[PDB]
Design a protein around this ligand. Structure first.
Ligand SMILES: COc1ccc2c(c1)O[C@@H](O)C(=O)N2O
Ligand SMILES: COc1ccc2c(c1)O[C@@H](O)C(=O)N2O
Ligand SMILES: COc1ccc2c(c1)O[C@@H](O)C(=O)N2O
Ligand SMILES: COc1ccc2c(c1)O[C@@H](O)C(=O)N2O
Lengths: 486, 486, 486, 486
């Protein structure tokens, strides 16, 4: 039982302005492969899969992935075949600077130049994410990567090299992808590279501090961001036609039960999920709720850092998938936080007070369909944060390998209905004044879904592992081709 | 320049239901006098004036006040002359139990019985406040009064004696008056008996802790309340026609400037001003904001205490005078709280972001006229807290002695306009569904205004200190007489 | 205490459409200088300063002003440096036709052609005001200028010469600037050229009639307008791509106190301030309120004049600075009007019924910041008058010379905050359907502020009187340069 | 074609509160008869019919009418049979004081005492109108009745005699009935006693001034009212349980066409129809619109008169029948007022801009059914005038003698549908907060309809002229009997 839209409710490209942009996304580690070719240095995810292979559900890794290092022309083609106007992809820090720092790798620069030139050549605008969890293992080894201040300057240099190499053609940038997801999973639960967590928790390397490392790393990301954006605006935007921002992972929230306590809980959830990194780029400081609950575990900004962070995004990306119910947790003697996400004192529930799940399951266990959540978030952006330019830089679902209800990987009617419903939810927001400039489906092609390996397929375009990684358009992709009047 | 209502905007008694109740209020220490007659023991306010007389602005005290211990028949008459249906007064703990505990003083009981019987005899319903800051100095001396747990049981015994002595005629009770005002001024700034504050602050007795004593005392008041209400409901309400609650001091708040930060500040102000004691009688715990900011300085409740506090009021009193702008304060390394009221991280401003004061001054420096604030608070009560029965148990203004714009103490047109505006604001609330059952003007008669002595006159009825404390109806009183169709 | 916008509330150029136009304004007399060069005849303001110099606060005049007759290339440059798309300037009637009538002065025509050609050459669109109080003193001397019907035809000829000389390049015109301000100040209080007022009032030439001259002159302006627009539409708009209107001075109004009487007062204020000249260009007659109160002092239109005036504007300019409270005045035996503005029976107050000023002071004594007022006015335009195309043709503030809170004339953060707030108020209007096509800041450069001389600085661009009248960008100007992505 | 309510839309007595009052009305001249018995002096209407009989359409007069001077017991019975709780009737000034002034006529007092005692005896509350156009012809002859100041004191004495004679039983009074209708028809068009109008107009006595007499008489009525109410409140309301007001004739208005000009016209219509006499009892002065348009023809009030008039009604009666479209009239040289009602510069139209009549005709030519109009008026009362206690003191329709669509005078289904629709419109008002305390149908019994004689039948109860003036319940009356659960 998965009810689809009625045909008269399906979005049409006319619903959006001529300038509104439709696209799809990927990230380096997830599609490139070639993890050690042409000089590329290893990344924290190379290292994490190569030393803790058992932390990937289906026992796979990103050594080869979709082989987009060699097959990128096929990716471009799939965009052109769907009629997408934008391609959001990321640059592999360790491919461009095998040691994190120092001598740039020409073969690395060349690769991106080729992808970029192919896009332009096919009328596709590149939106480039600078860092997508893809951190050079040399810097992890040298000083513990994002847990050390030195990452700030090193990131800055990396960002600069990107601006120098590609800034004449690439005019839209995201410094960082999903800092909240990264901090929670990489340093809190430790299910993602470098795999750290508190002693006694179960993760590859339980030698960290699930109550402090996530904040330390978060803090360094925001300082890095501020430095890079300052560098950019000052010396790399001489025509003024370039925009730079960051992409935030966000979940919608609804109060678990009707009570002023869950209303307050919902606000703490959104602060912790979204405001953790968005409020600093807006006002130059973390949300009050977080400071009040986290105190000394949450680093203080200097005056100049506040000023540098505030108003540091020209554009903001929102990666939206699902929503949760926020259920209030009391502060008491009985309870002490053990994971960073406990500091919100609001637990994310998949079922609400009436016993019902928030929305239908879509395949992988964490993605419940709730398009209203996106609309609500976009309206918070409009009303609370100044209605800055918003791009849905990720949105989509997974078909899980082996699911008997998805036997033909190309017949992704479920993904199509989901994407249509959310495209429509973005229209609702726009109609109410939200300033949403674009929609990028996450899943250009099936790729390496971090801890789920390839067993989770997110693409519009199938990737046939049995047929040389060939790109094959799924039903959803074919719909975009009509939608975009190809 | 003080603009009055247009005559067609003045409330009429028809505006309210037949059952709605109009009355006036006083408290023992403020009007009784006779501080050491017929066996009465000394109270913390006797002691505070007698040992720190310089902490009263005009150098006066409550030894005699309005002499209502002897002149109570005159008070009753003034109520009857205005046509009030309700009289809200308080019982002097130290007059009924000179040692706080132990042997009751018959002359004390007799006094109240006489007032009560006179009221009933004149068709006036008594609403009795059990404790109004009026704490027996024997218990202050014995164990530090409200700073010790022992106050809980001792209060309970006091409350019980009241129920036994007067419960057959008195059917409406308030356990405590303005716990927030009391905790802030008595243990925080220390301007009110027993006059405690942190070392280095300026107050009679700077040997306390402005960051902890206010909470300790607040905590004991709520435990006392819970015990008394449990005792009451169990053994002193055999007809089920008696109601018991508490009266809260409340100020309205408006965000200082239009920003989501002052919106959050306003919520913290209301939590700290109102929710500090109201949320515990509602859900059995302090507001989340307070727990998050105050942590270990704010005592924890036991399970059974939660359950006993929750739903412990049948009726709630709101003492409303004025409003403020709430201005957000950041949590930072630079700032540390020194007074308990700093823990809200929201400063109360009298002027907003546009440079304007919130409303017109009414006489004494802290009462700015802002009736919209009351309406807003009543709507929070309706929407957030279950819309429980609300009585405006205090509301009014002061004429300041010596103010050249108030040369004739009987010509209180300003007070009348203020009261009319607020009676009207209560009507607005009722029209929107707020469950407001009554309005009690604070100021039956001019009385001892704590740290301002008599220099602040709050009464509807003047008290001529030069003419033997004679009761004389002011303009406002005369208006109530017409309003109530006397 | 002057609270600024939070950084996330600051307008961005994206807030408005691609076709929306940002610009700045000036007027001939206020910036040109060269009052007697190349044949220019004297104007009523030359005459007024030269014979009544003491009526200018700081003892200055417009003989030289910003010397824009010679330095216009610098003005164009300052527009280009801020990235403005529009320049609103006025043509000096007495420079083009030294005798008001008759032989045109080539050097005069050449000057404007040069300014116009420079603008076009720099991608800046000229919006030209034909008359800006700038009336030829030959016509004042000959028949009393706007107080005689003959001004109608003479204005017509002037307008025609402008259309012939510049109509091939200038496609947007305003016939008259602020007729209400002009009539009130020039013929009512008499503080502006020609300085007339009733006998016994204090003004340069108290030989007029403050109850009749303002209307007579107003009436002649509207007839002049009608004739010029008829001439234009008939013989000077052969491509149909030209638009012609007028610019109105307007203040926002709020009822002084909450009462249906001040509601009626507010309507009379807006009628008298705005509707005096706007209702005639809309329906061909003065507002009913004015006719009912002014009777025989307010000239009647002929049928054909009604028809010619009605629908005579393609575009309307609104010069907005501030707002007032409207306080009702009764009609009675006690009261008789003495100034034309008394005929509204509504006094403009700077403080409302609660004692507060309407908004913060911005420098010069009459400009209180109240952006909501503009939004309200634009919504009246939409809802009541057909939502015709509206340009904010003036808006801004003054820094007063010698104000100790504005020691550095370039650090005009206050002006910047004000302009940002109003740009934002225009966005609010647009979002609600108001048809606002553009925003012109008054103050391209500091200039001669009529009766305040240069002591009032309104410019985005400073004019250094000590440094040869050099143009220097202030903080606000620099912000527009970023805003316009220069 | 007259569409009736669906049966589920018919009001039920449950729709209104227990205290809401249903009743019916009459006036002395219209039902009493006995115009010269037991000493009664002649009234202006005796005189007007006896000297200008041709001004009554059907050639009849009120010499005998319904003979209620003798048959009043039958009127009481008809009220009791319908279950009405209230009876609104008027006292004949000339029956109680045959010379207007001086010696009271006992037989006159006795009559009213008997009616009053019968009502009370049958559980019916009397609401008494003191003057209902019924003016003693001795005072007309002596000084021209309401056109002379002397009427003020004389009315006062009359009112006093009523208070003395009946005030112990009658607790609700209306000083004057429909002053607007009276002034317009009696002194403007002159179709009603004393029949005055300007020379050259057609009315019995064209020796008056249709532009001044209506105002002079109106002015004297308001002064009379003020004096009487002051006398009453001071010396005739010793229990405070008596209420005194006036009844206003009111028509609903809708703008003729959608334009801000007809919006302004509608406001002038309501001012002139309703505000003419209501605004003075509210704020102590005529509406601003009227003063501005009427100037010197509209008498000025003294300070003390303002204060005495303001807030002079405890209750207000509204006599509602129908509505009109208000169509704007320009002030111009072409137009001059000739009738007082021209001074509104808004003509009352029966058909709107789309060509449709406002509502269905109900019998007599001026009563078009438009219940929405009443609801709107009641909401103006609530929102603009303080929401004072409102009684619909008249409401109903006429069956015209000889109308072929009303052959059986008892089968008044049309009246019943109309009354039901308006009872329902009053419910709508109440549901929206209007303070409407009662509904009195005009037409207890058919009576003398002034200039239409008996040919217009307004009663719930038929009066059989062919069967000795016997009272016979019509269909509508029978419905009230069920409605009131008799
Ligand atoms: C709960 O497991 C996940 C929750 C959120 C994420 C995840 C895994 O990995 C990718 O799908 C991703 O882009 N985010 O944001
Ligand atoms: C700021 O000074 C005061 C503020 C509030 C109070 C006060 C003094 O004393 C009494 O007027 C009172 O009932 N409260 O609530
Ligand atoms: C109250 O003094 C002024 C009020 C309005 C104006 C003025 C002076 O001169 C210029 O600033 C102007 O453009 N107007 O509209
Ligand atoms: C237009 O003719 C009339 C208009 C209004 C009235 C009238 C006659 O006589 C009675 O029906 C009455 O009570 N009024 O108000």
């Amino acid at each position: 039982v998965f009810t689809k839209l009625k045909p008269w409710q399906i979005p049409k490209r006319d619903w959006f302005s001529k300038d509104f942009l439709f696209g799809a996304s990927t990230s380096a580690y997830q599609i490139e492969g070639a993890w050690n070719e042409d000089g590329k240095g290893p990344s924290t995810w190379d290292h994490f899969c190569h030393t803790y292979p058992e932390r990937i559900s289906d026992g796979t890794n990103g050594d080869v992935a979709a082989n987009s290092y060699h097959m990128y022309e096929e990716d471009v083609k799939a965009l052109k075949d769907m009629g997408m106007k934008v391609y959001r992809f990321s640059i592999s820090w360790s491919r461009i600077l095998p040691n994190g720092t120092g001598k740039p790798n020409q073969k690395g620069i060349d690769y991106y130049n080729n992808l970029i030139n192919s896009l332009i050549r096919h009328g596709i605008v590149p939106y480039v994410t600078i860092w997508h969890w893809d951190t050079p293992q040399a810097l992890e080894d040298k000083y513990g990567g994002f847990l050390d201040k030195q990452i700030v300057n090193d990131y800055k240099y990396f960002a600069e090299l990107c601006f120098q190499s590609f800034g004449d053609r690439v005019k839209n940038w995201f410094t960082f992808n999903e800092p909240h997801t990264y901090c929670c999973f990489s340093y809190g639960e430790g299910i993602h590279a470098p795999g750290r967590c508190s002693p006694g928790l179960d993760c590859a390397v339980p030698e960290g501090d699930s109550l402090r490392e996530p904040y330390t790393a978060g803090h360094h990301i925001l300082l890095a961001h501020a430095e890079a954006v300052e560098l950019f605006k000052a010396h790399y935007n001489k025509h003024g036609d370039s925009k730079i921002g960051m992409a935030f992972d966000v979940m919608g929230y609804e109060p678990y039960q009707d009570s002023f306590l869950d209303d307050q809980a919902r606000e703490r959830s959104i602060d912790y999920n979204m405001g953790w990194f968005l409020e600093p780029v807006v006002r130059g400081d973390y949300p009050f709720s977080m400071r009040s609950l986290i105190g000394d575990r949450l680093p203080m900004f200097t005056k100049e850092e506040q000023e540098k962070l505030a108003s540091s995004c020209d554009i903001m990306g929102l990666n939206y998938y699902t929503s949760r119910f926020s259920k209030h947790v009391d502060i008491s003697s009985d309870y002490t936080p053990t994971l960073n996400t406990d500091d919100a004192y609001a637990s994310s529930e998949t079922t609400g007070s009436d016993g019902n799940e928030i929305g239908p399951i879509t395949g992988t266990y964490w993605i419940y369909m709730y398009p209203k959540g996106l609309t609500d978030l976009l309206l918070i952006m409009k009303e609370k944060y100044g209605n800055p330019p918003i791009f849905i830089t990720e949105n989509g679902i997974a078909d899980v390998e082996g699911d008997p209800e998805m036997p033909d990987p190309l017949d992704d009617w479920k993904r199509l209905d989901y994407l249509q419903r959310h495209i429509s939810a973005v229209k609702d927001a726009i109609d109410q004044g939200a300033d949403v400039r674009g929609h990028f489906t996450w899943g250009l092609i099936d790729n390496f879904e971090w801890g789920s390996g390839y067993s989770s397929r997110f693409g519009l375009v199938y990737i046939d592992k049995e047929d040389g990684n060939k790109r094959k358009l799924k039903k959803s992709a074919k719909w975009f081709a009509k939608f975009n009047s190809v």
